Amino acid sequence: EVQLVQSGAEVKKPGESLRISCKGSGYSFTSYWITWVRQMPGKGLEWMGRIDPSDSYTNYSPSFQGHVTISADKSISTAYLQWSSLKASDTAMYYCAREQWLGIKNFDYWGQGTLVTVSSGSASAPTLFPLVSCSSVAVGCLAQDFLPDSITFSWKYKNNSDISSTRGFPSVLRGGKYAATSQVLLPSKDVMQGTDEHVVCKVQHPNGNKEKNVPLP
Amino acid sequence: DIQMTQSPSSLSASVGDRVTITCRASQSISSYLNWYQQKPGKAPKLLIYAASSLQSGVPSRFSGSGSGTDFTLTISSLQPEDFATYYCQQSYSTPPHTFGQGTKVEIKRTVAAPSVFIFPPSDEQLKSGTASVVCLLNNFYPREAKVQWKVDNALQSGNSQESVTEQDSKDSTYSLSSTLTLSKADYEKHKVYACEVTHQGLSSPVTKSFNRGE
């Protein structure tokens, strides 16, 4: 079960240093290279560099050479991407990927990605508010005032079972902070014939997870 | 130093149709070409390697051909879950390995009108001093929709934001969320709030509204 797992989202200020991680599992970490790829917000993929964890021989792209450094620690089967003085241009998504070197090379397994946000802002966890309508009823949840933009939603009934009618909307930027919404649809019948008067909205975020009850009209 | 070029830039095709994407190299690269898929908000995924070899676990409707300077990805029968951005990549001129610019593929379906809901600000949010009104559109096609806020029949502007979802992976529709933000002061100055929606599948603009009391 090949698997590459990367560190979480980061918020850093111009001039700071940062080190991202990418840990492999389900294969001999030392028989495959590790490549780093960058995707600027809304743009395509850019190859950054390579490292052979067996001997740590690195190969950088002419574009990125100098401004970035690649390392690895085979004892803990992990590779890293490092900056010494971060710039505004470095705000993007960073992917690690396993690379094959036997014959024609290809990137056969990818990590989930690390969002690097470089700004003068300061990190903050979200604040939750419910959304209630004044043959299926709609109910929602509103998250506000969080940074970075790395948030996840989930819903639960009063009996801690899972609600699978979830709906996911992208975030929007406003005064250095992000906000997002989520909604669920419930059968009109089930609610009337029922003793539950609420449901639970949950958000996950690097700087803090939070819950909020949502009334059912 | 090797430039990879993709065509077409974007395209829209129906379920069951054939989709054809071309990748051109600035100089012979033998069979050192790979194809990737990137559905929005997720990491890429290897589809074809060595120009024409199907990575295990990839649907058999994907296939590749070509050698030298001309290559071609083909989805024999487009499926609703294939909406994504497709890239080619070269592994001959090392360094640097170079990608194509990408080709966006959308699924075409039949017109579908949106379901509309409106939500007032929560009393909890109001004691803190800001009021946010929300308006939701569910399962519509095509993507082009226009939401429109009115407070006491006076049109709003520059005080709202919105966002749109990806295409659903079974029914190929979109959804949209829009938020009107006002100060607690201004919110209790006016009474009737409404969002008006415009869309192909609606022969007449749809309006949803509530009054500040009830």
Ligand SMILES: *[C@@H]1O[C@H](CO[C@@H]2O[C@@H](C)[C@@H](O)[C@@H](O)[C@@H]2O)[C@@H](O[C@@H]2O[C@H](CO)[C@@H](O)[C@H](O)[C@H]2NC(C)=O)[C@H](O)[C@H]1NC(C)=O
């Ligand atoms: C946990 O509860 C869910 C949902 O029921 C909710 O609570 C009711 C009192 C009312 O508020 C409903 O509107 C809510 O949906 C149960 O799921 C449903 O259970 C009913 C039982 O009558 C059944 O008819 C529905 O088909 C179920 N729907 C789904 C999507 O499962 C669930 O069974 C409960 N879990 C446990 C462990 O008891």
